[PDB]
Each structure stands twice: as C-alpha cells, then as structure tokens.
Design a protein around this motif. Structure first.
Motif, PDB file in Angstrom:
ATOM      1  N   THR A 197       0.824  -1.202   0.000  1.00  0.00           N
ATOM      2  CA  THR A 197       0.000   0.000   0.000  1.00  0.00           C
ATOM      3  C   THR A 197       0.862   1.257   0.000  1.00  0.00           C
ATOM      4  OG1 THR A 197      -1.698  -1.177   1.290  1.00  0.00           O
ATOM      5  CG2 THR A 197      -1.885   1.226   1.138  1.00  0.00           C
ATOM      6  N   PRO A 198       1.489   1.546  -1.150  1.00  0.00           N
ATOM      7  CA  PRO A 198       2.352   2.721  -1.309  1.00  0.00           C
ATOM      8  C   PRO A 198       1.563   4.025  -1.299  1.00  0.00           C
ATOM      9  CG  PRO A 198       2.045   1.633  -3.417  1.00  0.00           C
ATOM     10  CD  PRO A 198       1.405   0.747  -2.384  1.00  0.00           C
ATOM     11  N   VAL A 199       2.249   5.124  -1.000  1.00  0.00           N
ATOM     12  CA  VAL A 199       1.612   6.435  -0.958  1.00  0.00           C
ATOM     13  C   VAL A 199       2.106   7.323  -2.095  1.00  0.00           C
ATOM     14  CG1 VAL A 199       1.219   8.517   0.399  1.00  0.00           C
ATOM     15  CG2 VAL A 199       1.376   6.293   1.542  1.00  0.00           C
ATOM     16  N   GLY A 200       1.193   7.695  -2.987  1.00  0.00           N
ATOM     17  CA  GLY A 200       1.555   8.541  -4.110  1.00  0.00           C
ATOM     18  C   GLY A 200       1.893   9.956  -3.685  1.00  0.00           C
ATOM     19  N   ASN A 201       1.237  10.931  -4.307  1.00  0.00           N
ATOM     20  CA  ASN A 201       1.475  12.335  -3.988  1.00  0.00           C
ATOM     21  C   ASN A 201       0.407  12.865  -3.036  1.00  0.00           C
ATOM     22  OD1 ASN A 201       3.690  13.140  -6.219  1.00  0.00           O
ATOM     23  ND2 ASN A 201       2.150  11.791  -7.143  1.00  0.00           N
ATOM     24  N   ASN A 202      -0.849  12.535  -3.322  1.00  0.00           N
ATOM     25  CA  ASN A 202      -1.963  12.978  -2.491  1.00  0.00           C
ATOM     26  C   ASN A 202      -1.713  12.644  -1.023  1.00  0.00           C
ATOM     27  OD1 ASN A 202      -3.525  12.316  -5.340  1.00  0.00           O
ATOM     28  ND2 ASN A 202      -4.433  14.035  -4.215  1.00  0.00           N
TER      29      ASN A 202
ATOM     30  N   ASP B 169     -17.389  13.364 -12.335  1.00  0.00           N
ATOM     31  CA  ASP B 169     -16.241  13.474 -13.228  1.00  0.00           C
ATOM     32  C   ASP B 169     -15.266  14.538 -12.732  1.00  0.00           C
ATOM     33  OD1 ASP B 169     -15.259  12.507 -16.019  1.00  0.00           O
ATOM     34  OD2 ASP B 169     -17.391  11.974 -15.994  1.00  0.00           O
ATOM     35  N   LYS B 170     -15.770  15.462 -11.922  1.00  0.00           N
ATOM     36  CA  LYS B 170     -14.945  16.535 -11.377  1.00  0.00           C
ATOM     37  C   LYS B 170     -14.322  16.121 -10.048  1.00  0.00           C
ATOM     38  CE  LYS B 170     -17.910  19.952 -13.583  1.00  0.00           C
ATOM     39  NZ  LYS B 170     -19.373  20.138 -13.378  1.00  0.00           N
ATOM     40  N   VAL B 171     -13.039  15.776 -10.084  1.00  0.00           N
ATOM     41  CA  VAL B 171     -12.325  15.364  -8.880  1.00  0.00           C
ATOM     42  C   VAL B 171     -11.066  16.199  -8.675  1.00  0.00           C
ATOM     43  CG1 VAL B 171     -13.165  12.994  -8.772  1.00  0.00           C
ATOM     44  CG2 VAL B 171     -11.224  13.564 -10.250  1.00  0.00           C
ATOM     45  N   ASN B 172     -10.315  15.879  -7.626  1.00  0.00           N
ATOM     46  CA  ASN B 172      -9.085  16.599  -7.318  1.00  0.00           C
ATOM     47  C   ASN B 172      -8.175  16.671  -8.541  1.00  0.00           C
ATOM     48  OD1 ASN B 172      -6.832  17.775  -6.210  1.00  0.00           O
ATOM     49  ND2 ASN B 172      -6.747  16.425  -4.417  1.00  0.00           N
ATOM     50  N   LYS B 173      -7.665  17.864  -8.823  1.00  0.00           N
ATOM     51  CA  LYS B 173      -6.781  18.068  -9.964  1.00  0.00           C
ATOM     52  C   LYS B 173      -5.609  17.092  -9.924  1.00  0.00           C
ATOM     53  CE  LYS B 173      -7.187  20.888  -7.368  1.00  0.00           C
ATOM     54  NZ  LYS B 173      -8.613  20.721  -6.969  1.00  0.00           N
ATOM     55  N   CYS B 174      -5.248  16.657  -8.721  1.00  0.00           N
ATOM     56  CA  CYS B 174      -4.145  15.720  -8.546  1.00  0.00           C
ATOM     57  C   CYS B 174      -4.511  14.340  -9.085  1.00  0.00           C
ATOM     58  CB  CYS B 174      -3.764  15.619  -7.068  1.00  0.00           C
ATOM     59  SG  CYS B 174      -2.189  16.432  -6.647  1.00  0.00           S
ATOM     60  N   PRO B 175      -3.485  13.551  -9.437  1.00  0.00           N
ATOM     61  CA  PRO B 175      -3.674  12.199  -9.970  1.00  0.00           C
ATOM     62  C   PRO B 175      -4.188  11.226  -8.913  1.00  0.00           C
ATOM     63  CG  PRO B 175      -1.350  12.617  -9.588  1.00  0.00           C
ATOM     64  CD  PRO B 175      -2.063  13.918  -9.342  1.00  0.00           C
ATOM     65  N   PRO B 176      -4.630  10.043  -9.363  1.00  0.00           N
ATOM     66  CA  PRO B 176      -5.153   9.002  -8.472  1.00  0.00           C
ATOM     67  C   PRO B 176      -4.063   8.377  -7.608  1.00  0.00           C
ATOM     68  CG  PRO B 176      -4.967   8.159 -10.703  1.00  0.00           C
ATOM     69  CD  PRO B 176      -4.653   9.627 -10.776  1.00  0.00           C
ATOM     70  N   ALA B 177      -4.422   7.325  -6.880  1.00  0.00           N
ATOM     71  CA  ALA B 177      -3.474   6.636  -6.013  1.00  0.00           C
ATOM     72  C   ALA B 177      -4.027   5.292  -5.553  1.00  0.00           C
ATOM     73  CB  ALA B 177      -3.126   7.505  -4.814  1.00  0.00           C
ATOM     74  N   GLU B 178      -3.373   4.213  -5.970  1.00  0.00           N
ATOM     75  CA  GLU B 178      -3.802   2.869  -5.600  1.00  0.00           C
ATOM     76  C   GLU B 178      -2.712   2.148  -4.812  1.00  0.00           C
ATOM     77  OE1 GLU B 178      -3.270   0.014  -8.995  1.00  0.00           O
ATOM     78  OE2 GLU B 178      -3.851   1.771 -10.180  1.00  0.00           O
TER      79      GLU B 178
END
Length: 59
Positions: free
Chosen positions: A2-7, A50-59
């Motif tokens: 469970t890595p942590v991206g940028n968000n 469809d309108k979400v955080n400008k930042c990319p996803p994270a899995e």
C-alpha cells in the motif's frame, strides 16, 4: 504494501490546502449559507462525479 503517491489525503471534513493536500477520490466542497452573507470555509468530501481533485489518483 500500500504505497503512498502524492496525495497526502487530509482529514475528511477539514479545509484543503491544495498541493495534493486532499485525496484524489475526494474533493474540496465550498458550500455557502443563506440568510445574509456569512458562508463558512470549505470541507474535504468524497467525490464520484467526473470533477475530482486536480491531482492524480493513487492505488
């Protein structure tokens, strides 16, 4: 594991500070109050539209 991206994913219901502060799946709701001016700050809440955080996803 469970890595942590940028968000950073702030506290749900709290105010956002941009810079991937809030989660991707969530957004920053900036509602307002009726009866004369006096709307409170914004709050972080989950988003499915469809309108979400400008930042990319994270899995």
């Amino acid at each position: 594991g469970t890595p942590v991206g940028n968000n950073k994913c702030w506290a749900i219901g709290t105010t956002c500070s941009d810079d991937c502060d809030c989660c991707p799946e969530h957004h920053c709701h900036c509602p307002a109050g009726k009866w004369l001016p006096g709307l409170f700050r914004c709050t972080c809440q989950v988003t499915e539209s469809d309108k979400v955080n400008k930042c990319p996803p994270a899995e």
